[PDB]
Amino acid sequence: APSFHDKYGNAILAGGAIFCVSTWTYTATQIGIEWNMSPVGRVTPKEWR
Amino acid sequence: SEDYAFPTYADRRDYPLPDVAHVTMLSASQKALKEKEKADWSSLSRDEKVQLYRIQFNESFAEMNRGTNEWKTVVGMAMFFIGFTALVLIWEKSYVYGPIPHTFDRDWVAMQTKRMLDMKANPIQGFSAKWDYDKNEWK
Amino acid sequence: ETDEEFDARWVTYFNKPDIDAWELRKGMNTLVGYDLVPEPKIIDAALRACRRLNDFASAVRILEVVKDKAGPHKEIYPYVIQELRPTLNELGISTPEELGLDKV
Amino acid sequence: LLPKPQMRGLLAKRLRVHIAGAFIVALGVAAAYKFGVAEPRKKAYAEFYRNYDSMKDFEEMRKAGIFQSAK
Amino acid sequence: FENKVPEKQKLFQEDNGMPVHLKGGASDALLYRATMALTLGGTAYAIYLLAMAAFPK
Amino acid sequence: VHSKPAREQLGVLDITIGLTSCFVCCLLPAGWVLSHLESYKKRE
Amino acid sequence: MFINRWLFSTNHKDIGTLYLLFGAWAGMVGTALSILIRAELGQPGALLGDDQIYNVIVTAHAFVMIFFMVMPMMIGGFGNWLVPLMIGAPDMAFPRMNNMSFWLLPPSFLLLLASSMVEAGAGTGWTVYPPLAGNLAHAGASVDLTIFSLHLAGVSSILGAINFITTIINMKPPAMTQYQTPLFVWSVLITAVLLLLSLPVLAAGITMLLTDRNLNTTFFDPAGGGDPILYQHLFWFFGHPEVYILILPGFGIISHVVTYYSGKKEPFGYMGMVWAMMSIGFLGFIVWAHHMFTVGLDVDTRAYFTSATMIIAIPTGVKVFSWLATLHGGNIKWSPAMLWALGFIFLFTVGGLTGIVLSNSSLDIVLHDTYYVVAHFHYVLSMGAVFAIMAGFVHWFPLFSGFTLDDTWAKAHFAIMFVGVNMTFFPQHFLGLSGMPRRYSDYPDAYTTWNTVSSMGSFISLTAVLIMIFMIWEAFASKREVMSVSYASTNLEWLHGCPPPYHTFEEPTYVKVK
Amino acid sequence: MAYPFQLGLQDATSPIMEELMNFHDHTLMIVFLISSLVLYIISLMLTTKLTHTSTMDAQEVETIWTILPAVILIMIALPSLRILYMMDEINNPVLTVKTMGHQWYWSYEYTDYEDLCFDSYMIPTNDLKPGELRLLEVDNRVVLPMELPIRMLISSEDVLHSWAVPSLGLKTDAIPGRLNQATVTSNRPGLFYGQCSEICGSNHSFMPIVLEMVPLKYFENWSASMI
Amino acid sequence: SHYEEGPGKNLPFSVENKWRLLAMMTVYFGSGFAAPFFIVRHQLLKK
Ligand code: HEA
Ligand code: HEA
Ligand SMILES: [Cu+2]
Ligand SMILES: [Mg+2]
Ligand code: NA
Q1: CATH number of H95-226, picked from 2.60.40.420, 3.20.20.70, 2.40.50.140, 1.10.10.10
Q2: Which of A34, B90, G159, G321 might form a disulfide with G101, Cβ 3.0–4.6 angstroms?
């Protein structure tokens, strides 16, 4: 209470953690940037000419 | 003016005893306190002792070596502004970046994988070593 | 740089009779600078000097800085206070643990 | 009655045991990298170039009609 | 030729308030205005020529 | 280094304005150019 | 009053003020160029079109970040503030050419801006390797504008180096041994000496190139018996001394902030510190061809150059171990300057070791001009010299303006920029080992993922730049003063007021007779 | 050919690359040794609590702090000179191939008998036939035989280039009027991909290197089939 | 004395008005960050 970091410190901790993980998951997954995943194990090789 | 030139009060474990006291003004109560300090050493009690320590030194060792929550304020602020950076990245994909080259299509990626498996690209441990060439699957 | 003569020169510099506040503080600070938890004889001489110089606060600051210099292992301060048991009740000085600055 | 603990060179003894710790964990990290990836790569080369046949590899590359040297 | 240093040594130690680059008289002030009027005018003419190189017709 | 109290302390609103103020005009120019690069691209 | 005090300045405090302003502006320009480069390199494809304009962007990035940011920030700026206050001098030895060198810098930046204006562009890089910069590949004036900007910056650096050497070895108090000055003075002294011995080398090289283009001569034209390898030799005889210029005041600043906030009254091994500084200064001139391992030199010459590069590696390690030793035994005050110093120690360590991995010669025959080199010099420069600049900046700011910094927000800046530069600069190890070369506006599919990660981290670093400029505003707006400064007994600069007045050391220091 | 999520080098094909990667992980275990050491020392003095601000003794630890990193650097430097000697070994030049970096492309010359010079251009993204790699493919590949030490005489026409195939392990600057010699060997046939590594105008990113190595009989079959 | 000294008085810009200071820092750093973007748009128009 007397210093700024006693309870507002935990508040900024929780807000930053939630804000960070939510926005990073949003930008990594739901937008549509491709990470160019490692093609081992996940894709079967279609035949090329 | 003269504050930088004069010796100044400070508190650290490096320099435990500063040249100047914590307080400079002396009240009548503090003058009487110094009189009883000059008086008998077994006749001064707990609250006079603690106020003498308070007027000589500002912060005690146990209350200045404490672990306070500024560090978690730092890491929270850092996560906040990295989240704002992620917002800038959302904008930076939504606006400046246009179409992507067609070589990244799923069928094109699969045929590229088949081609560089037929070439046996770096097949000792890198990429083609994890593909079974007889069973037509991976490892 | 032998330890016994180190102790002897420190104790005689501390119990020199015309000791003053500035040189007392200088001696305490440059002994704190050493990598050495001070001898209870050295702390005894410092308490005698603060007796001559009339400073409860300097005496209990010496006690608090040897507490800090004890470090992660707590067994040093009961040891030094059980050698300085007669001089603490002889000089009327109260331990910082007694007079309540360890807790906040 | 408490006995006399270590009073001389506390940080000296801590520094000695901790630089011994520094050396052993440094060789531990180096040996971790070694036993993890250095010799497994060498064993991969040994297996590949013991079982390797260049003409067989070229023919199974050539079988799909890819090089313009061999059509 | 005559030693005119000590008489010019009296015209510069006068604590009249002018800085060292202006104590000599009206010739120095005229020359300092002249070197201001062609350096700043030259710099303004320089950035115009660079802009004319930057933007074709 | 001990510091004297702020002569002109900034309020919650002042900090808000300060942070945004620059971010705004320190990224606005960037956004404009990057966002319209394709137009700019038009030789027209 | 304004034009008398600031445009015609003759005192080193305001000269360093205007250095700091110009260095901040150049840092802004270089940050914008880096963000544009990463805008290329965050998504595959021609966002701009041709890569010639991208090469212009990277050339401006290199020139602005080296010559207009780092040297005016710590060599000009911090030196001009500190070293008269460090050695007790009332002013610099030749403040009139100090002011000349300062006001020489914005014409160099303006000539580089005009080079960017010219439609040919400076598509060469930091290296201005002919015949790319000749009349055939670059039929324009932009590279001539860059060469003249190098002339302006070079003569400014020569004048500043002369002034710094004269001030250091002349106007210390006469009873002082030269081996008794604070280590930033020694660092900037060796810096100014190497500037003096390496800046005429760039002058010779770029006059050679300018004469090669404009006057029909054949210094680097293969059709006239010349050779570009001569320009490479001259430019790297410049170049490695110049990167040691960009690192030595970093050594001094980090040593000072460590010995300040670590509680030690003296750094460990002062003689070893000064010996290591002079040793890397001496060996900085005979290792210039470690950038030359793939050009086609003689093989015994390559062996000598890599061996001498190990010989320059050893005393820097002595310097690093002396930093760890002076960190040992002291109570650590958790000011942000220690956070910058510790970041400098670890990141400079890994960058120098990356430099050693390059320094093995055949490893450059596999690894020359890839992004492994990019990772090396961005570790050791883009956050080595940058973190040292930050440490000195957040340290001496109460001395520079009178207003302190709030530790929570300042550490927030430190943490975000540390994370951003690590995320930016750690993937180029994999980018270089996987084998993509420099100066590419688009990258293959293997490098896509790490390039995207690096660009995202670069945007994190941009957000850190925003929080820094907001923090400068917040300090200048809150205007909380300095109550007291510790360790002014050992640090001479802090005892003459925060900030020191216009006329300092009007009464000379009484140095002990011994 | 580089694969996504790659942390080390493209795997070895040449024996010189085999010793390069062996020495490379030697240097990596050395740097990891030093990095872990400095990490534990930094963590030690940030995790400590005791104080020593007295006169510190200086002339006791710089002796070991000078001699043992000297041992580390000399054991780093000795295999570097060993590999340099491996490139200093004599040649068995079954073929001589000359590369001539032209403005934004390459030209490769086989001139030992029946002089032929072909042009390595750049294939575009829209003209990429299905299944290929982007920014790497060339319509005219560079044909070599396997298992043979071949001379590589490397120069450039009007601007500096840098012939760099990282998989096989070659990188030399193509300089006008100065052709460098590179010993190309391998152990496998197939395609190998590399880039230009020196800035050379408005298509610097658009100069790749493709090398296909196959049995000698197919090599002269190719060389006869063109002409 | 001859020049005014004190905290904030050794800067070439005024400090007393924090909003005016914010405006001048905003336009200063905005021009600094906007110069290369106007370079790239000027070259895109030129090309
Ligand atoms: C801050 C500037 C700076 C600094 C200090 C350095 C320092 C070093 N640099 Fe670098 N360098 C650059 C800036 C810098 N460099 C730039 C800007 C380029 C590219 C320019 C261009 O291409 O345009 C470059 C390029 C460059 C190359 C070119 C690679 C190529 O293109 O083929 C090489 C290779 O030898 C190299 C090597 C080194 C070495 C060996 C050091 C050493 O001085 C580092 C020493 C530091 C250490 C920390 C040593 C490690 C010691 C310890 C960790 C102590 C403990 C050790 C033991 C116990 C053994 N540098
Ligand atoms: C000082 C030197 C310096 C600095 C800081 C940087 C910083 C950065 N560099 Fe830079 N870079 C070079 C010097 C530097 N670089 C050189 C010399 C080259 C080679 C050019 C060539 O190939 O010819 C290069 C090349 C280079 C490339 C290669 C381009 C290519 O080959 O295609 C890339 C791309 O990722 C890159 C990225 C970055 C990034 C993302 C940053 C980020 O770290 C940017 C963030 C850093 C800062 C913002 C610095 C801090 C300064 C301030 C915050 C402002 C100062 C103001 C005050 C302190 C008040 N750099
Ligand atoms: Cu170098
Ligand atoms: Mg080159
Ligand atoms: Na791009």
Answers
A1: 2.60.40.420
A2: G159
The resolution in Å comes to 3.3
DSSP labels, G19-38: HHHHHHHHHHHHHHHHHHHH
The structure tokens 């081992």 sit at: A40
Of G34, G108, G255, G370, the catalytic one is G255
Pick the CATH number of H15-85 from 3.20.20.70, 3.40.50.620, 3.65.10.10, 1.10.287.90: 1.10.287.90
CA I6, distance to chain mean position in Å, is: 22
d(CA B2, CA G21) in angstroms, rounded, equals 30
Instruction: Give yes or no: G439 in active site.
Output: no
**Ligand 2 atom with the shortest distance to the CA of G31:** 48
On whether residue G489 sits in a domain, the answer given is no
Task: Please state, as a whole number, how many other Cβ atoms lie within 10 Å of the Cβ of residue D17.
Answer: 10
Three-class SS state of D4: coil
Helix axes G336-359, G299-327, angle to 10 degrees: 160
Burial C39-53 (b: 16+ CB within 10 A, else e): bbbbbbbbbbbbbee
CA dist., res. H176 & res. C42, Å (int): 80
Give whole-number Cα distances, G347 to E20, G184, G279, G342, in Å.
50, 21, 22, 8
> What approach was used to elucidate this structure?
cryo-EM
- Residue G495 inside a domain? The answer is no
Q: Is residue G136 part of a domain?
A: yes
- Site of tokens 């006329």: G503
Catalytic residue among G319, G395, G413, G429: G319
Domain hosting residue G291, numbered range: 1-477
| CA-wise closest residue to C93 among G483, B49, G417 | B49
Tally of structural domains, chain G: 1
Using a 6 Å cutoff on CB, does residue G421 contact ligand 2? yes
How close is the Cα of H174 to the center of ligand 4, in Å?
10
Q: Which DSSP letter does residue C95 get?
A: P
Calpha distance H138→H107 (Å, rounded): 12
Contact residues of D toward H, CB < 8 A: 10-11, 14-15, 18-19, 21-23, 25-31, 33-34, 37-38, 41-42, 45, 49, 52, 54-55, 57-58, 61-62, 67-70
| C-alpha of residue G427 to centroid of ligand 2, in Å | 15
